[PDB]
Amino acid sequence: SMFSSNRQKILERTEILNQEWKQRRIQPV
Amino acid sequence: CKYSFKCVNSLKEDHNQPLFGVQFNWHSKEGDPLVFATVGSNRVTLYECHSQGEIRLLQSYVDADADENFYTCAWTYDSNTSHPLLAVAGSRGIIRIINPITMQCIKHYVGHGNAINELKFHPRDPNLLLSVSKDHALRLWNIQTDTLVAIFGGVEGHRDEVLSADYDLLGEKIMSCGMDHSLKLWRINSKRMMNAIKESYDYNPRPFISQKIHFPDFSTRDIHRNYVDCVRWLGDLILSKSCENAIVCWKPGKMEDDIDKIKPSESNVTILGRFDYSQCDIWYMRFSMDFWQKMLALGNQVGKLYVWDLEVEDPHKAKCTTLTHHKCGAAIRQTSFSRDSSILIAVCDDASIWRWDRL
Ligand SMILES: CS(=O)(=O)c1ccc(-c2cnc(NCc3ccco3)n3cnnc23)cc1
C-alpha cells in the first residue's frame, strides 16, 4: 500500500539520520 | 494509538509576551540533558528538562533592539568543533546565530527585505540554513562561509509572503508554502544547486554570487483555499494546513506518480487523507512531528493539544487523547518533541510553557 511503503521510506531515511547522529558527539549546552 | 502523556509542569516567562517558537535541541548526544529553546518578543530562552517535571532555566538572550520579535529558532552544530549553535529570527528580518553555551550572538545575516517566519537546517549538512520570508522568497545560506547560496523566488516564485518550508528526510528537496495559497517544490539535489552549495564552501575573500532560482519543480494552489502557514514532509507525502481546521496529507501528481519523476508542469495533485481538529482557524499555528515521524502534534487557539499516531493508516482512528489542562487556555503557537519522544513542550500566547511527559 501507499502507507506501508511511505512508512518504510521514513524508516530507512530516519535510520540514516539516526546512524549519523549516533556517530556525532555534540558538546552539551 | 495508545500514546498517553501527563502534564508534569508549566511555567510563565516574566516578559509576559507571546511565545511564537519552541525547539528541542535534537543534536545533543544520548544521555546528555534535554534542552529546548523558546522564542518570543526580543528573547531567546534556554531550558533543561530534568526529573520530576523540572524545567531548569539555563540562560536567556536579550536582543539589544527591544522592537525585535522572534518568530522562529533552529538548532545546528559547528561541523569542525562539534559545538552546538542556535539560529533565531523574526520581525526585523535578521538571522542571528547565537552561541547557546554562552548565550551570546556569534554573527548575523541581513538580506531579506521583510520578516522571517521560518528557519530550517539541512538534515545532512549542518551549515545550510534555509530562511523563509514575508519578502516572497526563501533564502539558503552557508553559515560556515557566510554566503548566501540561493534565493528561491521571482518569476514563478511565491506571489505573497512565505509562511513555512521544510526539507525532505535526506535534504534533496524543499517544499515551501505561503499567503498566495500555493505549495512549491524546490529541488536542491539538482546539478545547479549541488554546484552552488559546493561553490559556497570554496568561497574565501569580489563577493559571492547567489543563484537566483526563479522556477520551482512543482507548484499547486489546489490543496487549500486560503493561506498555507505550515508544511512538513511525511516521507514522500506532504502534510500542510490552512484555516480549514484540518492538516491535509497529499502528494504532487496522480496516485502512482513517484516524487522524483514529477515534471515542473505537473497539473495533478492527490489528496490522501485528513487530520481534523478544532479551534485552530487563525494564522501562525504550527504543527510538529517527533524524530521518527510516528507522532503528530498541533496546539489550537484555546490551549488544547492534538496528538495523532502516524503509524495508524486511518487519519480518524489515529487521533490520541487530546491534551488539556484547566489553566492552559492561551493559543499554543508551537510544540516540540524531545528527540526520544519522551517529552513534548508547548508554548503559548500568554508566555507559558507546558511539559507533557509520555506514559
Ligand atoms: C500578539 S498577536 O497580535 O496575536 C500576534 C500573533 C501572531 C504573530 C506571528 C506569529 N508567528 C509568525 N511567524 C511564524 C510562523 C510562520 C508560519 C507560522 O508561524 N508571525 C509572523 N508574523 N506574525 C507572526 C504575531 C503577533
The closest alpha carbon to A19, from B348, B124, B159, belongs to B124
The closest alpha carbon to B32, from B355, B346, B338, belongs to B338
3-state secondary structure of A28: coil
Specify the resolution in Å: 2.5
Closest-CA residue in chain B for A29?
B101
Strand B211-213, strand B147-152: pairing: parallel
Q: Which ligand 1 atom lies nearest to the CA of residue B21?
A: 14
Check if the beta carbon of residue B61 is closer than 8 Å to that of residue B105.
yes
CB contact under 8 A, B82 and A26: yes
A interface test, pick of B47, B61, B169 with most A CB neighbours within 10 Å: B169
- Distance of residue B24 Cα from the nearest chain A Cα, in angstroms: 12
* Residue spans per domain, chain B: 1-359
CB contact under 8 A, B27 and A14: no
CA distance B160 to B134: 7
Residue that is written with C-alpha cell 570554496 in the block? B202
Method: X-ray
Q: Phi-psi region for residue B124, left (φ > 0), alpha (ψ -120 to 50) or beta?
A: alpha
3-state secondary structure of A14: helix
Check if the beta carbon of residue B87 is closer than 8 Å to that of residue B95.
yes
> From ligand 1's centre to the CA of B19, what distance in Å?
9
CB contact under 8 A, B293 and A2: no
SS3 string, chain B, reads CCCCEEEEEEEECCCCCCCCEEEECCCCCCCCCEEEEEEECCEEEEEEECCCCCEEEEEEEECCCCCCCEEEEEEEECCCCCCEEEEEEECCCCEEEEECCCCEEEEEECCCCCCEEEEEECCCCCCEEEEEECCCCEEEEECCCCEEEEEECCCCCCCCCEEEEEECCCCCEEEEEECCCCEEEEECCCHHHHHHHHHHHHCCCCCCCCEEECCCCEEECCCCCCCCCEEEEECCEEEEECCCCEEEEEEECCCCCCCCCCCCCCCCEEEEEEEECCCCCCCCCCCEECCCCCEEEEECCCCCEEEEECCCCCCCCCEEEEECCCCCCCCEEEEEECCCCCEEEEEECCCEEEEEEEC
DSSP A15: H
3-state secondary structure of A29: coil
Closest-CA residue in chain A for B249?
A3
Q: How many Cβ atoms are within 10 Å of B263's Cβ, its own excluded? A: 11
A interface test, pick of B76, B236, B272 with most A CB neighbours within 10 Å: B236
Architecture of domain B1-359: 7 Propeller (2.130)
CB contact under 8 A, A27 and B169: no
3-state secondary structure of A25: coil
> From ligand 1's centre to the CA of B240, what distance in Å?
17
The closest alpha carbon to B297, from B256, B243, B335, belongs to B335
C-alpha cell at B114: 521583510
